[PDB]
Design a protein around this motif. Structure first.
Motif, PDB file in Angstrom:
ATOM      1  N   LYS A  97     105.650  51.082  48.329  1.00  0.00           N
ATOM      2  CA  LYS A  97     105.485  50.923  49.769  1.00  0.00           C
ATOM      3  C   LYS A  97     105.366  52.282  50.467  1.00  0.00           C
ATOM      4  CE  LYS A  97     107.156  48.162  53.637  1.00  0.00           C
ATOM      5  NZ  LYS A  97     105.890  47.373  53.645  1.00  0.00           N
ATOM      6  N   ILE A  98     106.204  53.235  50.069  1.00  0.00           N
ATOM      7  CA  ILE A  98     106.190  54.563  50.679  1.00  0.00           C
ATOM      8  C   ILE A  98     104.841  55.263  50.498  1.00  0.00           C
ATOM      9  CG2 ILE A  98     107.215  56.889  50.650  1.00  0.00           C
ATOM     10  CD1 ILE A  98     109.867  55.489  49.748  1.00  0.00           C
ATOM     11  N   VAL A  99     104.302  55.226  49.284  1.00  0.00           N
ATOM     12  CA  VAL A  99     103.099  55.983  48.963  1.00  0.00           C
ATOM     13  C   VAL A  99     101.866  55.350  49.592  1.00  0.00           C
ATOM     14  CG1 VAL A  99     102.486  54.869  46.778  1.00  0.00           C
ATOM     15  CG2 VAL A  99     102.014  57.307  47.131  1.00  0.00           C
ATOM     16  N   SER A 100     102.013  54.103  50.029  1.00  0.00           N
ATOM     17  CA  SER A 100     100.937  53.381  50.696  1.00  0.00           C
ATOM     18  C   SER A 100     100.947  53.608  52.209  1.00  0.00           C
ATOM     19  CB  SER A 100     101.063  51.890  50.387  1.00  0.00           C
ATOM     20  OG  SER A 100     100.886  51.645  49.003  1.00  0.00           O
ATOM     21  N   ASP A 101     101.913  54.387  52.685  1.00  0.00           N
ATOM     22  CA  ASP A 101     102.223  54.492  54.112  1.00  0.00           C
ATOM     23  C   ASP A 101     101.357  55.488  54.880  1.00  0.00           C
ATOM     24  OD1 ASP A 101     103.888  53.346  56.129  1.00  0.00           O
ATOM     25  OD2 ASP A 101     105.014  55.230  56.249  1.00  0.00           O
ATOM     26  N   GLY A 102     100.414  56.131  54.205  1.00  0.00           N
ATOM     27  CA  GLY A 102      99.529  57.042  54.906  1.00  0.00           C
ATOM     28  C   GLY A 102      99.473  58.479  54.421  1.00  0.00           C
ATOM     29  N   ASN A 103     100.621  59.114  54.179  1.00  0.00           N
ATOM     30  CA  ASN A 103     100.668  60.504  53.724  1.00  0.00           C
ATOM     31  C   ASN A 103     100.741  60.639  52.206  1.00  0.00           C
ATOM     32  OD1 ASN A 103     100.851  61.779  56.473  1.00  0.00           O
ATOM     33  ND2 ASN A 103     101.694  63.477  55.265  1.00  0.00           N
ATOM     34  N   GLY A 104     100.639  59.518  51.510  1.00  0.00           N
ATOM     35  CA  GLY A 104     100.666  59.520  50.062  1.00  0.00           C
ATOM     36  C   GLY A 104     101.948  60.123  49.517  1.00  0.00           C
ATOM     37  N   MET A 105     101.814  60.908  48.459  1.00  0.00           N
ATOM     38  CA  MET A 105     103.006  61.473  47.828  1.00  0.00           C
ATOM     39  C   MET A 105     103.581  62.657  48.598  1.00  0.00           C
ATOM     40  SD  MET A 105     102.890  60.956  43.697  1.00  0.00           S
ATOM     41  CE  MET A 105     104.651  61.309  43.629  1.00  0.00           C
ATOM     42  N   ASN A 106     102.907  63.084  49.665  1.00  0.00           N
ATOM     43  CA  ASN A 106     103.460  64.142  50.504  1.00  0.00           C
ATOM     44  C   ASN A 106     104.764  63.718  51.172  1.00  0.00           C
ATOM     45  OD1 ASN A 106     101.277  66.316  50.374  1.00  0.00           O
ATOM     46  ND2 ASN A 106     100.098  64.560  51.116  1.00  0.00           N
ATOM     47  N   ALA A 107     105.059  62.418  51.157  1.00  0.00           N
ATOM     48  CA  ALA A 107     106.352  61.911  51.636  1.00  0.00           C
ATOM     49  C   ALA A 107     107.537  62.509  50.882  1.00  0.00           C
ATOM     50  CB  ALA A 107     106.384  60.393  51.537  1.00  0.00           C
ATOM     51  N   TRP A 108     107.305  62.935  49.644  1.00  0.00           N
ATOM     52  CA  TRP A 108     108.335  63.562  48.820  1.00  0.00           C
ATOM     53  C   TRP A 108     108.170  65.067  48.879  1.00  0.00           C
ATOM     54  CZ3 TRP A 108     106.179  58.882  47.199  1.00  0.00           C
ATOM     55  CH2 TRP A 108     107.096  57.838  47.014  1.00  0.00           C
ATOM     56  N   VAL A 109     109.107  65.733  49.547  1.00  0.00           N
ATOM     57  CA  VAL A 109     109.016  67.171  49.757  1.00  0.00           C
ATOM     58  C   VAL A 109     108.940  67.933  48.437  1.00  0.00           C
ATOM     59  CG1 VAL A 109     110.149  69.194  50.787  1.00  0.00           C
ATOM     60  CG2 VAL A 109     110.188  67.007  51.989  1.00  0.00           C
ATOM     61  N   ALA A 110     109.729  67.527  47.451  1.00  0.00           N
ATOM     62  CA  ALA A 110     109.708  68.209  46.164  1.00  0.00           C
ATOM     63  C   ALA A 110     108.349  68.056  45.494  1.00  0.00           C
ATOM     64  CB  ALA A 110     110.821  67.702  45.252  1.00  0.00           C
ATOM     65  N   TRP A 111     107.701  66.907  45.661  1.00  0.00           N
ATOM     66  CA  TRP A 111     106.366  66.746  45.087  1.00  0.00           C
ATOM     67  C   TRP A 111     105.378  67.712  45.733  1.00  0.00           C
ATOM     68  CZ3 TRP A 111     101.544  65.460  47.012  1.00  0.00           C
ATOM     69  CH2 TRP A 111     100.544  65.293  46.047  1.00  0.00           C
ATOM     70  N   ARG A 112     105.367  67.773  47.061  1.00  0.00           N
ATOM     71  CA  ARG A 112     104.443  68.657  47.747  1.00  0.00           C
ATOM     72  C   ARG A 112     104.680  70.112  47.352  1.00  0.00           C
ATOM     73  NH1 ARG A 112     105.043  71.298  52.373  1.00  0.00           N
ATOM     74  NH2 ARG A 112     106.821  69.989  53.004  1.00  0.00           N
ATOM     75  N   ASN A 113     105.947  70.512  47.256  1.00  0.00           N
ATOM     76  CA  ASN A 113     106.239  71.927  47.015  1.00  0.00           C
ATOM     77  C   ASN A 113     106.229  72.371  45.566  1.00  0.00           C
ATOM     78  OD1 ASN A 113     106.416  72.560  49.741  1.00  0.00           O
ATOM     79  ND2 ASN A 113     108.594  72.021  49.838  1.00  0.00           N
TER      80      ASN A 113
END
Ligand SMILES: [Cl-]
Ligand code: NI
Length: 129
Positions: A97-113
């Motif tokens: 549900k989270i990853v479908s919410d628009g910002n994709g995996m950027n919702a997870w700060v550790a993933w982005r960084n």
């Protein structure tokens, strides 16, 4: 439960995360490594009073109810404690549900960084999938 890298990769694949919304399995394993060190019981309090729960550090302000986060939306319709189980089903279902919410995996700060733009398929190397 503390998962091994390949053990978690296999569990995530069985629960349908491989290429979910275009994110290959290595992205999910990488996110879990840096969010929780593969530990289903991980919890961390945030400055705003919310808490992150489980292998993917899902937040109580929006996604689950922990009974102490005023104005929680509980969009995954689950108590946050369910996200700490040895069975990762609830965490995976909520993460979809989270990853479908628009910002994709950027919702997870550790993933982005720490994962975004890196060779994430190193995370599944050597695994029998
Ligand atoms: Cl995306
Ligand atoms: Ni967090």
């Amino acid at each position: 439960k503390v998962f091994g890298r390949c053990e978690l990769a296999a569990a995530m694949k069985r629960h349908g995360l491989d290429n979910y919304r275009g994110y290959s399995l290595g992205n999910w394993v990488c996110a879990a490594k840096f969010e929780s060190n593969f530990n289903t019981q991980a919890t961390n309090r945030n400055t705003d009073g919310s808490t992150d729960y489980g292998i993917l550090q899902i937040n109580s302000r929006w996604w689950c109810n922990d009974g102490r986060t005023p104005g929680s939306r509980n969009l995954c319709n689950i108590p946050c404690s369910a996200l700490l189980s040895s069975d990762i089903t609830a965490s995976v279902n909520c993460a979809k549900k989270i990853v479908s919410d628009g910002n994709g995996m950027n919702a997870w700060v550790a993933w982005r960084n720490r994962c975004k733009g890196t060779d994430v398929q190193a995370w599944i190397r050597g695994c029998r999938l």
